[PDB]
């Protein structure tokens, strides 16, 4: 068998060249990772140092950086509802802000920071802006 080289950390291009030089076929998967930078390799399947048949396909897990999610719209909800919905989307760190609104939005969410539909790391604090006035 041919040993799968350990390409964790290598750029996707460099890792793929290394694997190709050993005769492997390649498929890539793009996955979040908290410690390998974007476009660098997390690991392979089959894993580094495994012995496999010459020419076998190796799956190369390529980092897209830390996990990110799209911020859901939570406008006109209560703060409590907004926290539940943001939590369901993967976020967990929240702060409240006040900003002037029309009477019927007073006490309701008028937006977030980062704003709705923006992609954000799930480690980021999401400010939930509530109408005041």
UniProtKB/Swiss-Prot annotation:
Induction: Expressed predominantly in exponential phase. PknB levels are regulated in response to hypoxia; its expression is down-regulated during hypoxia and recovers to aerated levels upon reaeration (at mRNA and protein level). Disruption phenotype: Essential for growth, it cannot be disrupted. PknB depletion in M.tuberculosis results in cell death and aberrant cell morphology, and leads to complete clearance of the pathogen from the host tissues using the murine infection model. Residues 2-64, 65-132 form the PASTA domain. Autophosphorylated. Dephosphorylated by PstP. It is found in: Cell membrane. Overexpression causes major growth and morphological changes that indicate defects in cell wall synthesis and possibly in cell division. Homodimer. Interacts with the FHA domain of GarA, FhaB and FhaA. Belongs to the protein kinase superfamily. Ser/Thr protein kinase family. The intracellular kinase domain and all four extracytoplasmic PASTA domains are essential for PknB function and cell survival. The PASTA domains interact with peptidoglycans and are required for PknB localization. Protein kinase that regulates many aspects of mycobacterial physiology, and is critical for growth in vitro and survival of the pathogen in the host. Is a key component of a signal transduction pathway that regulates cell growth, cell shape and cell division via phosphorylation of target proteins such as GarA, GlmU, PapA5, FhaB (Rv0019c), FhaA (Rv0020c), MviN, PstP, EmbR, Rv1422, Rv1747, RseA and RmlA. Also catalyzes the phosphorylation of the core proteasome alpha-subunit (PrcA), and thereby regulates the proteolytic activity of the proteasome. This is Serine/threonine-protein kinase PknB. The gene is pknB.
